[PDB]
């Protein structure tokens, strides 16, 4: 008959030469790739390995990926046989409330983000430092003890759902001062955590640490020095392990998809991490997304039998790049707008492949660069400046000034203007000052933490408020000849403490001039 080495349901010559699934009169048909038909329909040329039951070493087979007999929550770019399906869970903290262990309490709203430094995941919470001394409000001695409380949400960014189990999360202050350990209550909640969703999702109540219902869980407490350092840095750090529980699999006799107890995630993740090539990308809305594409490991005979994966085809099958008229690009955004950061060993390998091909521009030879397994590639955006965790905290002044070109409704109540959703992220505040014709400048919010004057409106734009720190009064324009400068600051320039000299004033803060208009009918 027809040889089938791996018993996955697809013969060998189809798996080395290209196969695709066609439907004619409502019946699934598995065909050899015949290119004069199958480009007109829009079907896709799959390739896989003849001697692996799953090519990317994930729990779903080759046949069950190409035909749709798979768990329905799996993301659509994980349907390809060469892209691995595995969950990636980090923890999203929304607000924190600090209190004294018996007003004297603090309630702030935090903004967390997922990090990647220079396999395990984590997240970094940046507590908002503006208005609404922490020891003065709380009334703490040296013999004090503090109580910490917050609201968290588990978020999935991977490509596979997690059934009934949540990970075990450690809470880290500074570098390695563990304040607490968060576990999932009752150990089995009958929930689901789909890819790109939350738990509990955005229209329910968040999980509270030590909630109003239960009491017997461990109270989270600090001493005085931990509270000093937390007032210094405004920054906690979550760390999450990788216990994800059992796997949902398919059954052929009735089409049911059920949680099979004889199959676990914690014994199949260290195969995906050993036989794939990881590409991280943040061109979507400046949040880091991680994918893994199966690639050829040359020194292993069952790993050289995978298909050959150029970097162009890896970007196409992973992130939805496409080339409309030759230039490979991502929803208009061309790839000359994107960097390439490598780690050490794959930088050595890419440099040897470029020296072999006698080319020096990597952006022109992407269809010839081969990927091997165990790589690490980071593709960032050129416009912004990134800190130690590959988070956009800075920009160049050109795009920051060009974000504020398009004006809508200017007055003396404030500014309402159309601003881009990518450039809102890097900006931390605004400074607003009044300049005479003679050369005196009077900043009207003379503190480091009265800069939160912009506010988003649910139609999709932001409205700057001038009244907000001027005793809810409109802008006093005595002589409308002289003007008011209102302009911005970036997160890499923002101060998060009083100074070592105690300076609360707005001096020393770097700044980008975005706005100066006359004061009459133009503004």
């Amino acid at each position: 008959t027809v040889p089938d080495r791996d018993n996955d349901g697809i013969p060998d010559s189809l798996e080395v030469e290209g196969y695709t699934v066609d439907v004619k009169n409502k019946r699934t048909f598995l065909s050899p790739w015949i290119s004069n038909i199958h480009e007109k329909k829009g079907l896709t040329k799959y390739k896989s390995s003849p001697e692996k039951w799953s090519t990317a070493s994930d729990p779903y087979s080759d046949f069950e990926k190409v035909t749709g007999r798979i768990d329905g929550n799996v993301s659509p770019e994980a349907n390809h046989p060469l892209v691995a399906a595995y969950p990636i869970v980090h923890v999203d903290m929304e607000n924190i409330i600090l209190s004294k262990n018996e007003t004297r309490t603090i309630s702030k709203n935090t903004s967390t983000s997922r990090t990647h430094t220079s396999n395990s995941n984590s997240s970094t919470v940046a507590i908002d430092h503006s208005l609404s001394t922490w020891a003065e409000t709380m009334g703490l001695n040296t013999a004090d003890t503090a109580r910490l409380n917050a609201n968290i949400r588990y978020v999935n960014t991977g490509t596979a759902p997690i059934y009934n189990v949540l990970p075990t999360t450690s809470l880290v202050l500074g570098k390695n001062q563990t304040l607490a350990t968060i576990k999932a209550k009752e150990n089995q909640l009958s929930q689901i955590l789909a890819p790109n969703n939350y738990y509990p999702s955005k229209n329910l109540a968040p999980i509270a640490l030590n909630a109003q219902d239960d009491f017997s869980s461990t109270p989270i407490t600090m001493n005085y020095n931990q509270f000093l350092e937390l007032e210094k840095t405004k920054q906690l750090r979550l760390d999450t392990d990788q216990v994800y529980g059992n796997i949902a699999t398919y059954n052929f006799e009735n089409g049911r998809v059920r949680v099979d107890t004889g199959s676990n995630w914690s014994e199949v993740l260290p195969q995906i991490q050993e036989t794939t090539a990881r590409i991280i990308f943040n061109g979507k809305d400046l949040n880091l997304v991680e994918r893994r594409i199966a690639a050829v490991n040359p020194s292993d005979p069952l790993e050289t039998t995978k298909p050959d994966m150029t970097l162009k085809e890896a970007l196409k099958i992973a992130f939805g790049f496409n080339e409309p008229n030759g230039n490979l690009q991502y929803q208009g955004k061309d790839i000359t707008e994107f960097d390439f950061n490598f780690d050490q060993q794959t930088s050595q390998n890419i440099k040897n492949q470029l020296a072999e091909l006698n080319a020096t521009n990597i952006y022109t030879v992407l269809d010839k660069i081969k990927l091997n397994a165990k790589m690490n590639i980071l593709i960032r955006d050129k416009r912004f400046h990134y800190d130690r965790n590959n988070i956009a905290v800075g920009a160049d002044e050109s795009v920051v000034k060009e974000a504020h070109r398009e004006v809508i409704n200017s007055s003396t109540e404030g500014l309402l203007l159309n601003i881009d959703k990518d450039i809102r992220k890097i900006l931390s505040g605004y400074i607003v000052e009044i300049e005479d014709t003679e050369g005196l400048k009077e900043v009207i919010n003379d503190r480091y933490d009265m800069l939160n004057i912009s506010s988003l409106r649910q139609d999709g734009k932001t409205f700057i408020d001038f009244k907000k720190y001027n005793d809810k009064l409109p802008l006093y324009i005595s002589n409308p000849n002289y003007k008011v400068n209102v302009y911005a600051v970036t997160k890499e320039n923002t101060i998060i403490n009083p100074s070592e000299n105690g300076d609360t004033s707005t001096n020393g803060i770097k700044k980008i001039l975005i706005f100066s208009k006359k004061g009459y009918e133009i503004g």
Binding site: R5, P11, E17, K24, P32, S35, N36
Partner: protein, 723 residues
């Protein structure tokens, strides 16, 4: 269930090897594993047209036999329509008078589908361009396949098998388009052969274009062996080696011949012509005076040749009692032909429709011929045998015998009449003696039907010296395929048949008889066991006579209201009626000589009503002098049946017909001179002609009887009032 070490054994069966033969032995065995899938027939034909199979290494433009190719021919498009170069590609085929197959050898032909697929594509391109273009193929059969592909609902076959030029062609495919674009048809046939051979893509070619799958499957089963033998027919030495083997095998029966056997064979060849002095001296009486004064060119019972023979007999020396002497002297001048007697009787050589000792001499000579034909064909010097025959269409039918060939050019076949021919020509019964050929000889001008008989292991035959063979009597033939060929720019008909015993064919005809009886008792409301339709069929065009009965009876049903049908068929069931749809001669179905008075008073025409036993005959091949088709013949005879039933509803102890009454003879002399010439002979034929034309398919022929004979219209519509 399979445990895990059994999976270790299966995966080591696929993985581990023990012997490695180097490179070149595996290179050699990969090429033979490539060519093992092709049928051996196209390899043998590529051997016979002068072709060389060169399995080479390295470059294929570096071989000697492809050295003089130009720069232009080194741009090759593969199976998918995409570009290639011959120093990059691996198989090329050289066109012309000395073809060459060049294949680069590698170990990639054993598991891959692509390279083997392109090799079978080049072999199919050789088959479409070189071998089949020597017998003028592909042709109308494959054009019907192409028009079935491009007139489908779904557009996947057009994408799979056609180029861009064949897509944008707005009309359908005519044979002009096969003339001036034959290379495109060759490409399409090559691509279909490529997808059929390589066994991974066979289900794909079945799914995306099923009609090409059916064509190529039936092709590679039968037509490839038939085409190899017809290609050997074009060569002379194959013909004479087949001649040599047949002469050596049939030598001893020709050695066991006597003088009487050779005389019987030569009298079976030609008819024994009558001499004229033996005719004239036979009379010598008043009979000579009746032959001497006679209207030669007036009586319509004898043919043209027969009236000319009587004109020849006047110089060797009237619709009244002299023409009975013409009826008696019709059978007196017919030649002693065994083939005409076997052709007219249909197996009953005891039918007393001719003279006495002539019947006995016929029967004894037929028993002598059948006793001499005793040798079987089963032998070891040969494989399958392909024996031919050129035959006239008029020996099967006279309805299609005139309009088969187109009138603008007489070397075409009219396709509408060809599809009417093709529709129901499923089998054949050979009662008479098929004098068949060993090899091909070109046909006479009246014979476009080109038979090709495949024999049985039990075929009984005898040998002739002049290049012919004779088959015995009562042989069954089941038709395989009927197609239009072209040979020397003259379009023909090729027909195959396969020898079966007679019991299977008569079993089929018995089943069809029981089915038509059940259906037409169910449609008329009659007793369960009544036999109202019967078939005495023994000739070559049997299947279409079996199938055409349905159209004949439905057209008779639609042309008359149901009440007259029910009443007159009830009368016929009471009077032991039949509707004999037969293709043998009218005096030999034994519903007609069991009531006539004289042998020479027998009738042979289109339809016939036997008045005593109330039967309606019909004849298969013969066509009426008046009629346009057989359905008007059946209405024409139902006219005489209505005449008889109206003759019974005047007095149940008196005359048989209503037209023999003198109350219709006046209307026959008044309005019997405005209609067609067939009914003008006497009153009954005008009666049947009026009843035929009043119920026509189109209403204007019904309106001609309205305008020409209105009182006869009112009288016939009073003759339906007898209910």
């Amino acid at each position: 269930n399979k445990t895990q070490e059994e999976h270790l054994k299966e995966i080591m069966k696929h993985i581990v090897k023990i012997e490695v033969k180097g490179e070149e032995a595996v290179k050699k065995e990969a090429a033979e594993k490539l060519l093992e899938k092709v049928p051996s027939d196209v390899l043998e034909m590529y051997k016979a047209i002068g072709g060389k199979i060169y399995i080479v290494d390295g470059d294929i433009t570096k071989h000697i036999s492809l050295e003089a190719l130009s720069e232009d021919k080194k741009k090759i498009k593969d199976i998918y329509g995409k570009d290639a170069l011959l120093h990059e590609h691996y198989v090329y085929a050289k066109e012309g008078y000395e073809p060459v197959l060049v294949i680069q050898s590698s170990e990639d032909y054993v598991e891959n589908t692509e390279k083997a697929l392109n090799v079978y594509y080049e072999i199919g391109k050789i088959l479409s361009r070189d071998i089949l273009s020597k017998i003028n193929q592909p042709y109308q059969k494959f054009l019907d396949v192409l028009n079935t592909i491009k007139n489908a609902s779904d557009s996947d076959g057009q994408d799979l098998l056609f180029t861009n030029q064949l897509k944008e062609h707005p009309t359908d495919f005519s044979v002009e388009f096969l003339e001036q674009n034959s290379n495109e048809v060759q490409e399409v046939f090559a691509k279909a052969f490529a997808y059929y051979i390589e066994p991974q893509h066979r289900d794909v070619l079945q799914l995306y274009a099923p009609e090409a799958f059916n064509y190529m499957d039936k092709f590679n089963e039968q037509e490839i062996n038939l085409s190899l033998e017809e290609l050997k027919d074009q060569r002379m030495l194959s013909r004479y080696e087949k001649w040599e083997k047949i002469k050596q095998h049939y030598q001893h029966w020709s050695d066991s011949l006597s003088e009487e056997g050779r005389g019987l064979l030569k009298k079976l060849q030609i008819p024994i012509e009558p001499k004229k002095d033996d005719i004239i001296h036979s009379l010598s009486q008043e009979e000579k005076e009746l032959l001497k004064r006679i209207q030669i060119d007036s009586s319509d019972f004898l043919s043209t040749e027969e009236k000319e023979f009587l004109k020849k007999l006047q110089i060797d020396i009237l619709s009244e009692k002299e023409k009975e002497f013409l009826k008696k002297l019709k059978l007196d001048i017919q030649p002693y032909d065994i083939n005409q007697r076997l052709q007219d009787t249909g197996g009953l050589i005891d039918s007393p429709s001719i003279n006495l000792d002539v019947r006995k001499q016929y029967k004894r000579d037929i028993q002598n011929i059948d006793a001499l034909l005793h040798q079987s064909i089963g032998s070891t010097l040969y494989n399958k045998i392909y024996l031919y025959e050129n035959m006239n269409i008029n020996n099967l039918t006279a309805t299609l015998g005139a309009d088969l060939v187109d009138s603008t050019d007489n070397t075409k076949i009219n396709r509408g009449i060809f599809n009417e021919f093709k529709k129901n020509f499923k089998y054949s019964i050979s009662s008479n003696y098929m004098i068949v050929d060993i090899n091909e000889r070109p046909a006479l001008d009246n014979e476009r039907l080109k038979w090709r008989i495949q024999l049985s292991p039990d075929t009984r035959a005898g040998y002739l010296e002049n290049g012919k063979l004779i088959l015995q009597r009562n042989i069954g033939l089941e038709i395989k395929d009927v197609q239009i060929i072209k040979q020397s720019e003259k379009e023909y008909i090729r027909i195959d048949a396969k020898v079966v015993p007679k019991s299977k064919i008569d079993t089929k005809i018995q089943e069809a008889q029981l089915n038509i009886n059940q259906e037409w008792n169910k449609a008329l409301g009659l007793p369960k066991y009544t036999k109202l339709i019967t078939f005495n069929v023994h000739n070559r065009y049997a299947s279409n006579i079996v199938e055409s009965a349905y159209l004949i009876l439905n057209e008779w049903k639609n042309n008359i209201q149901s009440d007259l049908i029910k009443k007159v068929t009830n009368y016929l069931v009471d009077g032991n009626g039949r509707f004999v749809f037969t293709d043998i001669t009218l005096p030999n179905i034994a519903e007609q000589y069991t009531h006539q008075d004289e042998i020479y008073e027998q009738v042979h025409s289109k339809g016939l009503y036997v008045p005593e036993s109330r039967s309606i005959l019909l004849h298969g091949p013969s066509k009426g002098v008046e009629l346009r088709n057989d359905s008007e013949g059946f209405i024409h005879e139902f006219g005489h049946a209505v005449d008889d039933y109206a003759g019974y509803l005047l007095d149940k102890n008196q005359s048989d017909l209503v037209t023999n009454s003198k109350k219709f003879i006046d209307i026959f002399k008044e309005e019997g001179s405005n209609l067609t010439s067939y009914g003008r002979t006497n009153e009954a034929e005008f009666f049947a002609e009026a009843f035929r034309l009043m119920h026509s398919t189109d209403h204007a022929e019904r309106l001609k009887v309205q305008k020409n004979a209105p009182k006869t219209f009112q009288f016939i519509n009073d003759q339906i009032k007898f209910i």
